[PDB]
Paper text:
The MTase domain is highly conserved in flaviviruses and is responsible for methylation of the 5′-cap of the viral genomic RNA. In flaviviruses, the [name] MTase domain performs both N-7 and 2′ -O methylations, using S-adenosyl-l-methionine (SAM) as a methyl donor and generating two S-adenosyl-l-homocysteine (SAH) molecules as reaction by-products. ZIKV MTase is composed of three sub-domains: the major MTase core (residues 54–223) contains a Rossmann fold with seven, mixed, β-strands (β1 to β7) surrounded by two sets of α-helices (αA, αX and αD, αE) on each side. The MTase core provides the binding pocket for the methyl donor SAM and after the methylation step, it houses the by-product SAH.
Our second, new crystal form reveals the structure of ZIKV MTase in complex with the by-product SAH. It contains two molecules in the AU. SAH is still bound in the SAM binding pocket and therefore represents a conformation after transfer of the methyl group. The adenine base of SAH forms H-bond interactions with Lys105, Asp131 and Val132. H-bond interactions with side-chains Ser56, Trp87, Asp146 and Gly86 with the SAH methionine tail are similar to those observed in SAM. Although the two molecules in the AU both represent the MTase-SAH binary complex, they display significant structural changes outside the cofactor and cap-binding pockets, close to the putative RNA binding region. In chain B, spanning residues Glu38 to Gly52, there is no electron density in this region and this part of the model is entirely absent, indicating its intrinsic flexibility. Surprisingly, in molecule A of our SAH bound structure we observed that this region is present, albeit in an entirely novel conformation, which we term the “closed” conformation. Whereas in the MTase-SAM complex this region is in an “open” or “permissive” conformation (magenta colour), in our new MTase-SAH complex the onset of the A3 region has moved by about 6 Å towards the putative RNA binding region and is now in the “closed” or “obstructive” position (cyan colour). In this “closed” orientation, A3 is one turn shorter than A3 in the “open” position.
Numbering used by the authors: 5 to 264
Write the structure that this text describes.
C-alpha cells in the first residue's frame, strides 16, 4: 500500500547527485542571508540578523496565523536558537527557554543581542528526551534528522512524537512541532490520532527544501491530515518533473535590537 510520499521518497533516492542537487531548491521559498554570513560562520552574531534559517520558518507560520506565541515559550532542540530569538520579539511572549544537545556533531546556541535577547535563556548539553515535561504556554520543537530510509525517518518521527506528548499533556495553548516524516500510512494514522487528542493541524512551510517532506504540526491549523499530507506529497512529486524553477526570495529576517 504505497503512498504518494513513499513514491516521492523512492524517486528522490533514485536521483543522480546532479538531479538531487538541481531538485532540492527548485521553486522553493528562501531567505538569502548573504549579509552577515561570514560573521555567523565566524561565530559572532550581527545585530538583528537571524542565527539560522529557522527564524524565517517560524516567521512564516506566525505571520499567517498558524500560531500565536505567548507567555512562557519552551523551544526543544533549539540548536543555534533561531526559533527562540524570533519568539522573543513577539509582543505577548514573556520568557523563552531553549534546550539543545550541542557538542561535536551538533549546533551550539549562538549568543546575540537581537530585540528581546534578555528574556531568552538557551542551554546546551541537554538531552531533551531525558527532560521531564514542564508547564509552558507555547511549546516549540524542531527535532528530526533526515535519512534516505523512510522507515528510519518514520521511526525517528515516532520517537519525537512520543516525547512531545508528555509536554502537550501540560496543555500549552500554542505549539509548533516538526514532523520529519508524515507520509507513511502509520504516520498518517498516528497524526490523525494526535490531532484528535491535542488539536492543531499540519502545515507545509515553503522554505523547506524539496529534499525533505517535513511538515509542522501547529496549534493554529485545522487541516485534515490526508489533505495536508497528500497535497504536500503531490507538490513535491510535481517538482520532480519539468525544468528547474528559480527560488523565490523573502526579505531577510530582521529581529532588531534592544532589551524588553
Ligand atoms: N535528543 C536531543 N536533545 C537536544 N537536542 C537535540 C536532540 N536531538 C536533536 N537535537 C537538536 O535539535 C536541533 C534541530 S535544529 C532546530 C533549528 C532551530 N529551530 C533554529 O531555528 O535554529 C539540532 O541542533 C540538534 O542538535
Ligand atoms: Mg533570515
Amino acid at each position: 500500500g504505497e503512498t504518494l510520499g513513499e513514491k516521492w521518497k523512492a524517486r528522490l533516492n533514485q536521483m543522480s547527485a546532479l538531479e538531487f542537487y538541481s531538485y532540492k531548491k527548485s521553486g522553493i521559498t528562501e531567505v538569502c542571508r548573504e549579509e552577515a554570513r561570514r560573521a555567523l560562520k565566524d561565530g559572532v552574531a550581527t545585530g538583528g540578523h537571524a542565527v539560522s534559517r529557522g527564524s524565517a520558518k517560524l516567521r512564516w507560520l506566525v505571520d499567517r496565523g498558524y500560531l500565536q506565541p505567548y507567555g512562557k515559550v519552551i523551544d526543544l532542540g533549539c540548536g543555534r536558537g533561531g526559533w527562540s530569538y524570533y519568539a522573543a520579539t513577539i509582543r505577548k511572549v514573556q520568557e523563552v527557554k531553549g534546550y539543545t544537545k550541542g557538542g561535536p556533531g551538533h549546533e551550539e546556541p549562538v549568543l546575540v543581542q537581537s530585540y528581546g535577547w534578555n528574556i531568552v535563556r538557551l542551554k546546551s548539553g541537554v538531552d531533551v528526551f531525558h527532560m521531564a515535561a514542564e508547564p509552558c504556554d507555547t511549546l516549540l520543537c524542531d527535532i528530526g534528522e533526515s535519512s534516505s530510509s523512510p522507515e528510519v525517518e518514520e521511526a525517528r518521527t515516532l520517537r519525537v512524537l512520543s516525547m512531545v506528548g508528555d509536554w502537550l499533556e501540560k496543555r500549552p495553548g500554542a505549539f509548533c512541532i516538526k514532523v520529519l516524516c508524515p507520509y507513511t500510512s502509520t504516520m498518517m494514522e498516528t497524526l490523525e490520532r494526535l490531532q484528535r487528542r491535542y488539536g492543531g493541524g499540519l502545515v507545509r512551510v515553503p522554505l523547506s527544501r524539496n529534499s525533505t517532506h517535513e511538515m509542522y504540526w501547529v496549534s493554529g491549523a485545522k487541516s485534515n491530515t490526508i489533505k495536508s499530507v497528500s497535497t504536500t506529497s503531490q507538490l513535491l512529486l510535481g517538482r520532480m518533473d519539468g525544468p528547474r524553477r528559480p527560488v523565490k526570495y523573502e526579505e531577510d529576517v530582521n529581529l532588531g535590537s534592544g532589551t524588553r
